[PDB]
Design a protein around this ligand. Sequence first.
Ligand code: NAG
Ligand code: NAG
Ligand code: NAG
Lengths: 49, 44, 217, 49, 43
Amino acid sequence: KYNENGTITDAVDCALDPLSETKCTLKSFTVEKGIYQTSNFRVQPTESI
Amino acid sequence: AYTNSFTRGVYYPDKVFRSSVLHSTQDLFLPFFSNVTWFHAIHD
Amino acid sequence: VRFPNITNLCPFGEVFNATRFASVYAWNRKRISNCVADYSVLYNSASFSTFKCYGVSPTKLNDLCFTNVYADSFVIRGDEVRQIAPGQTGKIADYNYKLPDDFTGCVIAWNSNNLDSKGNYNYLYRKPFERDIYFPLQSYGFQPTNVGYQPYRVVVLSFELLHAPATVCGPKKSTNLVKNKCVNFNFNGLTGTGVLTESNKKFLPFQQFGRDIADTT
Amino acid sequence: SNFGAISSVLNDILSRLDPPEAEVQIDRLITGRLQSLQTYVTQQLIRAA
Amino acid sequence: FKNLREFVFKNIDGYFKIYSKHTPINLVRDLPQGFSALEPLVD
Ligand SMILES: *[C@@H]1O[C@H](CO)[C@@H](O)[C@H](O)[C@H]1NC(C)=O
Ligand SMILES: *[C@@H]1O[C@H](CO)[C@@H](O)[C@H](O)[C@H]1NC(C)=O
Ligand SMILES: *[C@@H]1O[C@H](CO)[C@@H](O)[C@H](O)[C@H]1NC(C)=O
């Protein structure tokens, strides 16, 4: 978040938690009441065959 | 010893002036609320 | 047209006319900065066997300018000249001298059959811009009687065009700046049309350009 | 967006490449930007309905 | 402590990039909580 003087005054770490993921998805530091689709769950492989 | 990094570790990703804007960028940043090793210089 | 009012000339002669080139296993990387880079000399010169640009066209280099320019200087065998390019693979491209596949710049080479060849056994070969200082180490015996087996002196000019303060700019004179009128501007190689006015935008000392939502200046 | 081009900025393509190469990079931007307008207009027509 | 000096050191393709910020503090025990962005100084 850049303010009127071009100074970064805040920031969101998009992988910190589900709320931060929502804030990054909506490109805002404020999230309105509701349900948002923010990402996709995918099970990762453990080893190769 | 370890401490809480909180919201520290954010730097300007490039040399472009921007203002009144929310900008999304991917770079090597210190993850928020991560653990940073705490060293001492008393009596490291 | 605006460029820093610097009159120093860039030391290309110290790279291209060097007494000795380094080996490819231990290639040199010279920094070129704080100077005027006239690329017409290198381009127009007939002494080069090749002058191939992957980044920008060679005739645009006179207008365009860079934050830094680096000259990677070393000796290879003639048939291996083809391997010094983005997207290439092979025993040289993969083992001793790798370029980024997004490399911006020009690869310039000429033979040294009348200078380095004797036999000359001082040239040894073995990530992008890595210097890797039964062995993997092999060398050439360059002799004047060996075309594809003759030594070549290759200089790779790596150009950084990221929008930041420029230090290496071409032989182009600046003009006066006119405010509050529609003009065709060129700031350090960045062009466009618009009205230039005084502003209250507090750029930080490291910032050279500002941008809008559309990524325009 | 680059759309496969070396740069999203049209002037940066033109100031760096000769026409035989600049045209290729520009065609990539034209296709992407023309497609972008078509997407916009279609959405406006549906929304207008 | 009176002075907090934050730095970032990273290496990209052989370039050692340094960012930093100096700010006054009034805290001895640990890092102060808050937000401050670091500008680049050296490459
Ligand atoms: C910008 O800097 C001025 C001091 O020159 C200050 O008064 C103003 O509040 C600053 N603006 C913001 C958004 O912090
Ligand atoms: C940080 O360290 C604490 C122990 O002091 C531990 O419980 C916690 O899980 C660690 N967190 C991370 C993200 O490593
Ligand atoms: C190298 O020397 C020749 C004269 O033999 C000169 O014409 C050429 O421009 C010089 N090269 C550079 C890069 O200055």
